[PDB]
Amino acid sequence: EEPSDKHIKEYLNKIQNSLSTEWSPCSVTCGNGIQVRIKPGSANKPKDELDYANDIEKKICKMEK
Amino acid sequence: DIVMTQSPLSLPVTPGEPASISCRSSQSLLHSNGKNYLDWYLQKPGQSPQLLIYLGSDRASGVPDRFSGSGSGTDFTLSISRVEAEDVGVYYCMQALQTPFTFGPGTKVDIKRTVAAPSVFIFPPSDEQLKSGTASVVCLLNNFYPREAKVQWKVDNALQSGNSQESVTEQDSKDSTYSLSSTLTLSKADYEKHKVYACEVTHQGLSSPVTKSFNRGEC
Amino acid sequence: KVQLVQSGGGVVQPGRSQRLSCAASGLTLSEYAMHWVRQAPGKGLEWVAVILSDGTKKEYADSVKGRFTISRDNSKNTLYLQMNSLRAEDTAVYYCATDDNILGHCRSKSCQRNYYHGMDVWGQGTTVSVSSASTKGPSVFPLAPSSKSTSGGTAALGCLVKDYFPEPVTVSWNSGALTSGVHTFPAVLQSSGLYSLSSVVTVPSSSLGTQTYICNVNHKPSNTKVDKKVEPKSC
């Protein structure tokens, strides 16, 4: 189903500074995971000031079962 | 289906001035998740649509600062702090709350310049065409602004109905003018029944309607 | 670059079928729900259909349900639209576009958060023209310059390019040596089902006696090429 907030935030921590305005890789190898990006309109925000709810966009990724 | 409306439908913008387009939906687009599912797209002449604004207020990648979206529920606005020549085209709002996605009718934006009356020119049919059994009469309105114009055909003072078609150019990059053709098509038999062929043009740059005309066969 | 490359389309008779393709390059199609949107000539945008990233939950506009079906092949990074029982009403440019909301959350079912960020990538469009007209090259007629097309030392002249099918034709003047002051008007569709357009140019009136003005009209569908010299009138 939908990746949890816990999952997405864990993933944001794992990708650290590779987070960018481009969609990340899928967070998983099998099943459903998340991809994340810095919202286009937030590209000028210092990384340390990015807000999970308002500056990070999310999309589900569906890998093979 | 959700019905989308826009106003105004035509929006000329003087260089340097801001512009604003209104979009209304027949049902709220505010979702329980807090987002307003309203997009704005621009379609430049001869191009595919492109995304400007999503979720009411978010700018898409590569969209200049001069574009902003505001609003919530059923009432939304696109604001353009200035309209560059490259911003001319048709602006559509679209709800993305639920399928079918539905679009507004479009707002056509152009660059507002000093009023310029058309040069009005008229062309009788060629003898070559007449030999073929048909007569096309062309009226040309050249290099005018604004785009709105009324062109009527009078044949021996009788208004023509149903037998003409217009074509209009896109706004010219350099001088911000338009040109327009109106083509009257008649049978050779009908064409030869009348003398005076007249194009009557009404336009903001003309204090009264201008008539260009010829007598059949004279020149 | 990141691109959706459309193919297919063209002229098709009423009642026949056409299949459109939309091939992604620079992005992975399986990361997107995909939409079709269309635009009839001179009209606004109309949503046509959507398909989720795994091919489930195909949906359609009422205007096409029963006749169109949407499909995809993620392994070929390609989206398709199958159009059956085509009607004149279906003539349009058809566009494909992306959607990050791969599985329809929020708009079709409950969601913990939003996943939609607009339709951000669009194909270049495919024209579908639904018509029974036969391919036909144009007649080219002079729009001859006269006192009735001359003002302030400038004369307008042109060529009327009438009764061709399908679009497009191209018009040059003097084999491309003359471009300034040219206006080649968008084609109009006539009652007959055939197209017609005019190309006009303004030039110095005093040149009419010495400079030949020729419109070069090409209609590739019919392999028609016409050069028409426009002769000036002294009246």
B9's torsion region: left (phi>0), alpha (psi -120 to 50) or beta?
alpha
Long-range contacts of B49-55 (CB under 8 A, 24+ apart): B49/B92, B49/C37, B49/C45, B49/C95, B49/C97, B49/C122, B50/C122, B51/C118, B51/C119, B51/C120, B51/C122, B52/B78, B52/B91, B53/B78, B53/C118, B54/B96, B54/C116, B54/C117, B54/C118, B54/C120, B55/C114, B55/C116, B55/C117, B55/C118
Is B87 near chain C, with CB under 8 Å? no
Residues A24-53 as b or e (16 or more Cβ within 10 Å = b): bebbeeeebbbbbbbbbbbeeeeeeeeeee
Identify the residue among C43, C185, C203, C235 best suited for mutation to test binding to B, counting B beta carbons within 10 A and taking the highest: C185
Q: In terms of C-beta density within 10 A (0-12 exposed, 13-18 middle, 19 or more buried), how is residue B152 classed? A: middle
Identify the residue among C117, C190, C233, C235 best suited for mutation to test binding to B, counting B beta carbons within 10 A and taking the highest: C117
Residue count of chain C: 235
- Interchain proximity B49–C117, CB inside 8 Å: no
Domains defined for chain A, CATH in brackets: 5-63 (2.20.100.10)
Is A21 near chain B, with CB under 8 Å? yes
| DSSP element (H, E) containing A11 | helix A5-15
Query: Is beta strand C10-12 parallel, antiparallel or unpaired with respect to C126-130?
Result: parallel
State the CB neighbour count (10 A cutoff) for residue A16: 8
Beta bridge partners of C92: C128
Pinpoint the alpha helices (H) of chain B.
Answer: 127-131, 188-191
Q: How far is residue C70's CA from residue C58's CA, in Å, rounded to a whole number?
A: 7
Q: Are A63 and A35 in contact (CB under 8 A)?
A: no
Which strands make up the sheet holding B164-168, listed edge to edge?
B119-123, B134-144, B178-187, B164-168
A-to-B residue pairs, Cβ atoms closer than 8 angstroms: 10
* Residues from B in contact with A at Cβ < 8 Å: 58-63
Q: How far is residue B131's CA from residue B156's CA, in Å, rounded to a whole number?
A: 23
Q: How far is residue C17's CA from residue C87's CA, in Å, rounded to a whole number?
A: 10
Radius of gyration (Cα) for chain C, nearest Å?
Answer: 24
Q: In terms of C-beta density within 10 A (0-12 exposed, 13-18 middle, 19 or more buried), how is residue B77 classed? A: middle
Residues of A in contact with B61 (CB under 8 A): 21, 40
Q: How far is residue C108's CA from residue C115's CA, in Å, rounded to a whole number?
A: 12
Is B48 near chain C, with CB under 8 Å? yes
Q: How far is residue C233's CA from residue C235's CA, in Å, rounded to a whole number?
A: 6
Is C31 near chain A, with CB under 8 Å? yes
CA-wise closest residue to A11 among A63, A61, A65: A61
Residue B58 CA: distances (Å) to CA of A18, A39, B69, B131, C194:
23, 9, 7, 62, 45
Residue B22 CA: distances (Å) to CA of B195, C70, C169:
50, 33, 38
| DSSP element (H, E) containing A12 | helix A5-15
Q: How far is residue B217's CA from residue B135's CA, in Å, rounded to a whole number?
A: 12
Cα C88 versus chain centre, distance: 15
- Interchain proximity C105–A60, CB inside 8 Å: yes
B125 φ/ψ angles, rounded to the nearest 5 degrees: -60, 150
- Interchain proximity A58–C103, CB inside 8 Å: no
Residue type, B106: G
Token code pair at residue A7: 């999952």
Residue type, C86: L
Give Cβ neighbours of residue B94 (< 8 Å, ≥ 6 apart): B4, B38, B39, B40, B41, B101, B102, B103, B104, C45, C47
Q: What is the resolution of this structure in A?
A: 1.8
Q: How far is residue C61's CA from residue B1's CA, in Å, rounded to a whole number?
A: 10
Q: What is the dihedral of CA C43, C49, C53, C54, to 10 degrees?
A: -160
Q: Where are the beta strands (DSSP E) in B37-118?
A: 38-43, 49-54, 58-59, 67-72, 75-80, 89-95, 102-103, 107-111
Where do breaks (C to N over 2.5 Å) occur in chain B, by preceding residue number?
none
- Tell whether omega for the bond before B8 is within 30 degrees of 0, i.e. cis: yes
Cα B211 versus chain centre, distance: 24
CA-wise closest residue to C37 among C126, C131, C130, C106: C126
Token code pair at residue A58: 């999310």
Residues of C in contact with A60 (CB under 8 A): 102-103, 105, 115
Q: How far is residue B53's CA from residue B71's CA, in Å, rounded to a whole number?
A: 12
Look at residue B74 and give its three-state secondary structure: coil
Which residues 146-165 in chain B show a CB within 8 A of chain C?
Answer: 165
Give the closest-approach CA distance of C116 to chain A in angstroms.
8
Token code pair at residue A50: 């990015």
Using alpha carbons only, give the angle C111, C65, C93 rounded to the nearest 5 degrees: 95
Query: Is beta strand B158-159 parallel, antiparallel or unpaired with respect to B107-111?
Result: unpaired
Token code pair at residue B143: 């290099």
Token code pair at residue B123: 């062309």
Residue C76 CA: distances (Å) to CA of C21, C33, C35, C72, C101:
11, 15, 17, 9, 20
Q: How far is residue C7's CA from residue B219's CA, in Å, rounded to a whole number?
A: 49
CA-wise closest residue to C186 among B166, A24, A46, B93: B166
Domains defined for chain B, CATH in brackets: 4-109 (2.60.40.10), 119-215 (2.60.40.10)
| DSSP element (H, E) containing B181 | strand B178-187
> Which of C46, C59, C106 has its CB closest to that of B31?
C106
Q: Are B71 and B40 in contact (CB under 8 A)?
A: no
Q: How far is residue B79's CA from residue B81's CA, in Å, rounded to a whole number?
A: 6
- Per-residue HEC secondary structure of chain C comes to CCEEEEECCEEECCCCCEEEEEEEECCCHHHCEEEEEEECCCCCEEEEEEECCCCCCCEECCCCCCCEEEEEEHHHCEEEEEECCCCHHHCEEEEEEEECCCCCCCCCCCCCCCCCCCCCCECCCEEEEECCCCCECCEEEEECCCHHHEECCEEEEEEEEEEEECCCCEEEEHHHCECCCEEECCCEECCCCCEEEEEEEEEEHHHHHCCCCEEEEEEHHHCEEEEEECCCCCC
Token code pair at residue C225: 């090429």
Domains defined for chain C, CATH in brackets: 3-130 (2.60.40.10), 139-230 (2.60.40.10)
- For residue B34, the 8-state DSSP code is S
Query: Is beta strand B107-111 parallel, antiparallel or unpaired with respect to B10-13?
Result: parallel
Q: In terms of C-beta density within 10 A (0-12 exposed, 13-18 middle, 19 or more buried), how is residue A4 classed? A: exposed
Residue count of chain B: 219
Q: How far is residue C228's CA from residue B87's CA, in Å, rounded to a whole number?
A: 38
Q: How far is residue B94's CA from residue B88's CA, in Å, rounded to a whole number?
A: 19
All chains having 3 or more CB pairs closer than 8 angstroms to chain A: B, C
Residue type, C122: W
Q: Are C30 and C74 in contact (CB under 8 A)?
A: yes
| DSSP element (H, E) containing A52 | helix A52-55
State the CB neighbour count (10 A cutoff) for residue B5: 14
Q: In terms of C-beta density within 10 A (0-12 exposed, 13-18 middle, 19 or more buried), how is residue B30 classed? A: middle
